[PDB]
Structure formats: C-alpha cells, structure tokens
Design an enzyme around this catalytic site. Sequence first.
Site, PDB file in Angstrom:
ATOM      1  N   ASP D  42       0.870  -1.148  -0.005  1.00 26.16           N
ATOM      2  CA  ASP D  42       0.027   0.052  -0.043  1.00 26.16           C
ATOM      3  C   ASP D  42       0.788   1.187   0.088  1.00 26.16           C
ATOM      4  O   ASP D  42       2.182   1.188   0.295  1.00 26.16           O
ATOM      5  CB  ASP D  42      -1.089  -0.180   1.099  1.00 26.16           C
ATOM      6  CG  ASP D  42      -0.393  -0.314   2.386  1.00 26.16           C
ATOM      7  OD1 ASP D  42      -0.160  -1.503   2.797  1.00 26.16           O
ATOM      8  OD2 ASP D  42      -0.476   0.529   3.211  1.00 26.16           O
TER       9      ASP D  42
HETATM   10  P1  LIG Z   1      -2.546   4.099  -1.007  1.00 25.74           P
HETATM   11  O1  LIG Z   1      -2.389   4.117  -2.571  1.00 25.74           O
HETATM   12  O2  LIG Z   1      -2.752   2.787  -0.461  1.00 25.74           O
HETATM   13  O3  LIG Z   1      -3.946   4.864  -0.945  1.00 25.74           O
HETATM   14  C1  LIG Z   1      -3.815   6.107  -0.076  1.00 25.74           C
HETATM   15  C2  LIG Z   1      -4.857   6.419   0.713  1.00 25.74           C
HETATM   16  C3  LIG Z   1      -5.343   5.194   1.429  1.00 25.74           C
HETATM   17  C4  LIG Z   1      -4.203   7.296   1.907  1.00 25.74           C
HETATM   18  C5  LIG Z   1      -6.158   7.219   0.080  1.00 25.74           C
HETATM   19  O4  LIG Z   1      -5.659   8.259  -0.792  1.00 25.74           O
HETATM   20  C6  LIG Z   1      -7.358   6.203  -0.632  1.00 25.74           C
HETATM   21  O5  LIG Z   1      -6.698   5.550  -1.237  1.00 25.74           O
HETATM   22  N1  LIG Z   1      -8.386   6.194  -0.081  1.00 25.74           N
HETATM   23  C7  LIG Z   1      -9.060   7.398   0.411  1.00 25.74           C
HETATM   24  C8  LIG Z   1      -9.887   7.246   1.627  1.00 25.74           C
HETATM   25  C9  LIG Z   1      -9.656   8.033   2.864  1.00 25.74           C
HETATM   26  O6  LIG Z   1      -9.959   7.569   3.964  1.00 25.74           O
HETATM   27  N2  LIG Z   1      -8.863   8.966   2.763  1.00 25.74           N
HETATM   28  C10 LIG Z   1      -7.926   9.582   3.510  1.00 25.74           C
HETATM   29  C11 LIG Z   1      -8.508  10.545   4.727  1.00 25.74           C
HETATM   30  S1  LIG Z   1      -7.570  10.186   6.154  1.00 25.74           S
END
Ligand SMILES: *P(=O)(O)OCC(C)(C)[C@@H](O)C(=O)NCCC(=O)NCCS
Lengths: 68, 133, 217, 87, 97, 115
Positions: D42
């Site tokens: 991740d």
């Molecule tokens: P990464 O590529 O695993 O993903 C980044 C992330 C998990 C931080 C986020 O951008 C995502 O993909 N989901 C958004 C949902 C969320 O809860 N946003 C962060 C607010 S604290």
Amino acid sequence: PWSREAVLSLYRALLRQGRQLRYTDRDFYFASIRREFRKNQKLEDAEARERQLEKGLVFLNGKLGRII
Amino acid sequence: HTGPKFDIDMMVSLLRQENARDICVIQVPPEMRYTDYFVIVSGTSTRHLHAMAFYVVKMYKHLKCKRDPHVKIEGKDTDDWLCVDFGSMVIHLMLPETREIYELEKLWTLRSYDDQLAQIAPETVPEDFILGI
Amino acid sequence: RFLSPEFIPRRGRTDPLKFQIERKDMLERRKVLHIPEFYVGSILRVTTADPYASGKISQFLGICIQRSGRGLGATFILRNVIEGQGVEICFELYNPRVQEIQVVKLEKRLDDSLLYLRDALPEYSTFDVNMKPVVQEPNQKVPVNELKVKMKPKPWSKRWERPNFNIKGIRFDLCLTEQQMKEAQKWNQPWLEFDMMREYDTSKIEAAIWKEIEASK
Amino acid sequence: DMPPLTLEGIQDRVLYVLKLYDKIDPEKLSVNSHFMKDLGLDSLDQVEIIMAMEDEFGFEIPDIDAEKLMCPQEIVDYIADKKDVYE
Amino acid sequence: GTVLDHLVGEETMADYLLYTLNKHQRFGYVQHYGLGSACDNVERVLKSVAVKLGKTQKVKVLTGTGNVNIIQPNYPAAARDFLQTFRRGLLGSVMLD
Amino acid sequence: AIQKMTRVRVVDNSALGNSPYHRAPRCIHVYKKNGVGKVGDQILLAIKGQKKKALIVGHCMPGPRMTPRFDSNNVVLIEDNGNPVGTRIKTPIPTSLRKREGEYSKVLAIAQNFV
Ligand SMILES: *P(=O)(O)OCC(C)(C)[C@@H](O)C(=O)NCCC(=O)NCCS
Ligand SMILES: [Mg+2]
C-alpha cells in the site's frame, strides 16, 4: 482525500514525532497510529475525507493535547 | 522526606517495573481544567491491576509531602477498570478490552474532533412545536 | 454619573455605620480588581480561579440577566447556551476568586430583568463563547437594544403576561390571544402608580456615597 | 568519515532493509520488482520504506519526490545522486 | 365507500382528495376547511383540522435548553373525519374524476 | 433536587439512554439519607422496562453561588460496579464533581466540557 500528498505527508510527520517520545511506550504509539490509518482508509466519501484529515491535522498540532 | 519528588518520570519508571503493558502519558494544557498529566496503563489480569495501583499509592505515601493530601483508589469492586487520582496526575488502569471501547487517549489529545462525538448528533424540537407521526 | 447598584442601600433600620464599614471594604477590593460599568442587557466574560483544580483559570461568557444584592455580597447572574445546554452562574462581585471582569458588549435591554429568557426561544440566549469586544466612544449615551423576543408555548416558568412583571420585551401578540390579555388585566392595580409613600428617592443618599467615593480615590 | 559507495554495495544494503520488512519476504523479493504492484504494498506502506532509507544514509528526502519512489531500482538510482557512481 | 376501505390506507386518500379539490374548487374549500393559506401540503391540512377539533394535547419533551410542550394530536382521529367532510356537502360538489 | 417520580434526561452516548421510547426515564429511588438528590448523588432509574443506577450531573434548582445551574436534569447511566455504560458525555458537567466524595474520576474521564 483533500490531497493524496497531504495524507501521506501526515502519516510521515506523525511517525517523526514518535521518535521524540520519552515516557509513552513507542511500540504502542506506532501500532496505534498504523491501525488508525488502515481501517479508516480505503473506504470513505469525499466530504468526510475533509473531516478525517482535519482530525489527523489537530493530532499533528497537539494544541488540545500532546502525547509524550 | 527530602529527595525524589512526585512527577511523571519517577511515576512512569515506577509503573514499568511491574510490567505495564502499554503506557500513554498525555500532557494536558491549562484550559482543560482537570489535570496537568493524564496517564493510561494496561494490565494482564484483574489482580495484576490491583498489584500496580496498590504499589503506586503505597510508594506515593512514602515520598508524599506532609501537607500533600491523601489519595483514594477508585473501583476496587470493578473487574476491568481501576483509577487513581493524584494532585496533578491522573492514572487509569484497564484491561486491553476496556481500552478498545473507551479510547481515552483519543478524547484527551483531540477534544471535540473525535469520531465518537461525530456519530451522535444534537436533537432539535420542530418549529411551531408540532410533531407529525 | 454611574453608581453601581450595590452601593445604594435598601430601606432598612440598619445603622449608617454598617454601610460605611462595608463601603470601605468594597472600595479596597475595587482598587485591586477593576469592576467595569455593565448593565443587565450587557455581555460579560469572567475569569476566575478554579479551586477544584490546582489554580487553573476558568473563563465563562454569557448575557447578564439580573443584578442584585447589596454591600460585599452583591451579585449578578450570567446566562448562555453551551453546545445545546442552558447554563446560569451567579457571581459575587467582591469574591477574591474572580481574576478579571471585562465588558464584551455594553447595552441595556427594555426591562431590568431578563429571567424570561429561559422561556424565550433558545437562540435569544445563545451567545458565541469567543467573540471580539466592541467598544464605543467614552462620552456616548448607553445604547439600548429594543429587541422583543419570541416565546415558547404558554406553560412558562412564571406568568409573564401579568402586569406585576411589566415586561416590555416580549412579543405577546405572537403567543397570547386577546381574551388572555384581558384576563391578565384583572390584576392591574392602577392606584399603585400613584402611591406616594411607596416611592424611594435615593438622591441625597447617592450624593453622600459620591462624596465618600471621591474621597477614596 | 567517507564510506566507499560501490553501486554493488548500495544494492546489497538496499535489499538488506527490504528483507528486514515484515510484509515482504525474500522469496518473492527481487532487485527489479516494484513495491506497490509486484510486492503488493500500500501507499502508506511505502512511507515507512523511505524512512528506512532516510536514516541509513542520513540525507533528507523531501515529501514532493518521496511519492515517485515506488521501485528499489529507482532508489539505487536516486541515492546515486548523493554520490555519483559510474562503474 | 362502495368498496372495502382496507384497500386504501388511512392517510392515503388525503393527497388524492386534495388534488381533486385543487382541480375544481379551493377557495370555498379553504373557507370551510379552516386553512390560513391555500397549499398542497397534506401535513398542513392535517394540522389545521386537529387544532379546529381541539383533540390535540400538550406533551412534554426535555431538552438541554429546557422542558418544552409540543402538541401531539390524534393523527388517526384527523384521518377519519376527512371521509365525513367529503361525504357531507360542506366542502362543495367536487367530482373526484 | 431530583427525588422519586422525577423525569430525568440521559446525557450519554449509551444506546439505552438515547433510544426512542414512549416514556421519559423516571427516578425510582435516591441513595441519600434524606430523599432529595443534588449533583454527584446516585439515583435509580426506570427506563425501557428495567432498573438502572445513575449519577446526577447538574440540575435546575439553584445551588452554591459560583456553581453552575443547568436547565435540564442530567444523569449519566452507570453500572453497579461504577463503570459508565456510555463512552462519551457531550453535555458539560460541573467541575465540582472532582472534589466531592466518591467514584467520580471515571465519569470525568469520559466528559469533554467542564463548566
Ligand atoms: P494508497 O495507494 O494505499 O492509498 C492512499 C490512501 C489510502 C491514503 C487514500 O488516498 C485512499 O486511497 N483512500 C481514500 C479514503 C480515505 O480515507 N482518505 C484519507 C483520509 S484520512
Ligand atoms: Mg416553577
């Protein structure tokens, strides 16, 4: 989120503070911050992402309470 | 009487030697009119929690100033949660079970911004004060 | 001139010396802590020492609703709705516990008591906890708010419609009916406006208090 | 102190830290496989990896570029900027 | 009432009869029915009738601000009187169709 | 003063307290030598077809001078143990609760606002 950068920045910045810990169990502090960023994320709507980021941002500031 | 004083550094080290599972020591600012330092420590068993709480209070009295008021342990009847209040320090002895349900660290670090406050919404009476089914 | 309500004594058989004693004590305390000119409508923020903690500082903001008592024990009561809960605190003026009293917004209302604000709609008593002081030029007439307030349903803490309360700051038209108004009128007592021995003139009394006060400074 | 920054030695210390990680095991770990897709990690996971690189070499990694670093090969090239290796 | 009334809900026919009356005659309906103003909201008319009958009662609710007296009428009671209001000639001759 | 057969308001995030119901919670009993209960006193509640112990937190009746006076009768649901059933207290609680004799520390711990 508001910004994909901002959340990864916040995750970075928080862990940097963890090194400076004195009294608090550093293993638990890290474990507690990790699971928070896991289970909350991957599943949210646009509007509530503005709120959850802010919640982390005030954690960063530690104005209302700082863990040591 | 003279020597070590009652403060965090001594108090935490004192806890740690009884195998305190997790320790969260939280600086509380003066606007929150409760305490200087909030402390949460976990335990293995119910009788382990009593061991710690009773040692801490016992050691307190040893190093206690004459005019420094005496303290009372709370919730000896309780299974999972024990609490002890000092002058400027507050300590919470819990199982890991009760830590998962109370989230005391989250409340005190970020006050009005916690998730648990978000779910609950204030209820308002309708205008003209008429209910409809 | 403005003389604080507490200084003017009530009709009594109390010897004058007792008031002189109490005035001297009050005036000493006034030197230490500045007591601002405030009225019943005005908004105050009060900072106090918290005895239940280790000398931590508490501030509370709200609208004054009544000012009463005489001598050292003289008081005032502040109201405010904090995050969906109405709170009232009665404060002593000459309590050493209080650190600072500031006038955030100095205004009079139509009537001298505002205890009806409990029965008024919540928003009329809801005041922002963090608001900036708004100040006016020193030689200005004390501004009056001519607001009348809308009410809740008729079961009230007291029967405000009755003329003994003489409330001018309630929108009676909205809540009451004409027949209710004429029912309330049965308690009028029209002679009481013209009762001559009922009146209490404080002219010479206040003059002598002024003489004492100017001597103090 | 000046350490010899051999490109081969750089590679060894880079793979040394990745096998130290819990999520990824040396079985599927390779020099050419990327973290996000191949190693199935991740975005938050990545942040920790770069921190491992941060303290090891003792040069600051800005947050602006930390995002684009998603491959071990990218890293061994990035840290080659610190001290130029030709070979 | 020709067919069984169990087919239609207790409050269901109110909106349909409101539509039918708005089609043909509303001013006389407003005068006979005690509305403050003409509107197509069934909740408003159900509130208007209850007050007229006086069957409503004050019921306490406790809030942080204070104890407030809401009026909670017999919504079921308002539901039936609609049928006699239609059947009787007070509203005026209005074909539903 | 909260006595027998008084309506109270449960100021908790507890499911039992915040649940929609046809009855307001009623004070069964007051744990004091005289029946009247001020702030900090424990009282028994009849809610939703069960008995539950509760702590009085602020009330309408005037108290000592500098102590706050609320506009509703606020109680927190507690177990017999002393553990509060709910997790959070939205409504402000008086600070005086601290110095009073008994188990108040836990309730203070879960409260956000002090007035
Ligand atoms: P990464 O590529 O695993 O993903 C980044 C992330 C998990 C931080 C986020 O951008 C995502 O993909 N989901 C958004 C949902 C969320 O809860 N946003 C962060 C607010 S604290
Ligand atoms: Mg009364």
